[PDB]
Amino acid sequence: SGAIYVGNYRVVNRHLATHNDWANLVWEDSSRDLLVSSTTAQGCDTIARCDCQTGVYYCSSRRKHYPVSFSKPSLIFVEASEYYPARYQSHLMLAVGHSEPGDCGGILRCQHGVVGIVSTGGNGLVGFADVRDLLWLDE
Ligand SMILES: NC(=O)[C@H]1CCCN(C(=O)[C@H](c2ccccc2)n2cccn2)C1
Ligand SMILES: [Zn+2]
């Protein structure tokens, strides 16, 4: 679990969005596993606007942060799960690191701010849904 709070927006994994997220929906994209909802309180986070390919993410299943090298956002095949059919997920970045069910939502940050959230895992890999292209989160 986990979310990004920026301005009057809450960014979560679409597959973990709550009834309240859907009732306050701003934008969602099943192909990216992202959903953004509106909030009444001002957020605590700021978003990176950069091309960093290294950073640090939070891994809830280890209660620890780990440094990673990750690929640029791209279209990657993701196997069928309880939440989605087999499909290509867009804007996804892979890295070598620990991620198991329950780790989705952990934040990946670089020196410029929040880069994205954990969205996939297994096999010693971790995938992050990028948010750096969502320029409207900042206004
Ligand atoms: N973006 C998606 O389509 C995700 C939706 C939820 C299922 N997905 C996973 O990767 C997870 C998982 C999560 C976090 C670390 C490891 C595994 N999972 C694999 C097998 C069983 N669960 C894919
Ligand atoms: Zn950066």
UniProtKB/Swiss-Prot annotation:
Cysteine protease that cleaves viral polyprotein and specific host proteins. It is responsible for the autocatalytic cleavage between the P1 and P2 regions, which is the first cleavage occurring in the polyprotein. Also cleaves the host translation initiation factor EIF4G1, in order to shut down the capped cellular mRNA translation. Inhibits the host nucleus-cytoplasm protein and RNA trafficking by cleaving host members of the nuclear pores. Counteracts stress granule formation probably by antagonizing its assembly or promoting its dissassembly. Zn(2+) 1 binds at C50, C52, C110, H112. The chain holds residues 869 to 1007 of 2193 of the full protein. The active site is at H15 (for protease 2a activity), D33 (for protease 2a activity), C104 (for protease 2a activity). It comes from Coxsackievirus A16 (strain G-10). It catalyses: Selective cleavage of Tyr-|-Gly bond in the picornavirus polyprotein. This is Protease 2A. Homodimer. It comes from the Viruses.
